[PDB]
């Protein structure tokens, strides 16, 4: 359990990518 910079930049973003490939918040 430590380490919590490099775990950024390779998971999250990833998960925005999949909620922007089925709906990219429209207005």
């Known amino acids: 359990m430590d380490r919590e910079m490099a ?4 998971g ?3 998960v925005g990518l999949v909620l922007l490939t ?3 918040h429209y207005k």
């Not at 775990?7 to 390779?10: D, P, V, Y």
């Open 7 to 10: 775990a950024s930049a390779g």
């Open 12 to 14: 999250a973003v990833f």
């Open 22 to 24: 089925l709906s990219p």
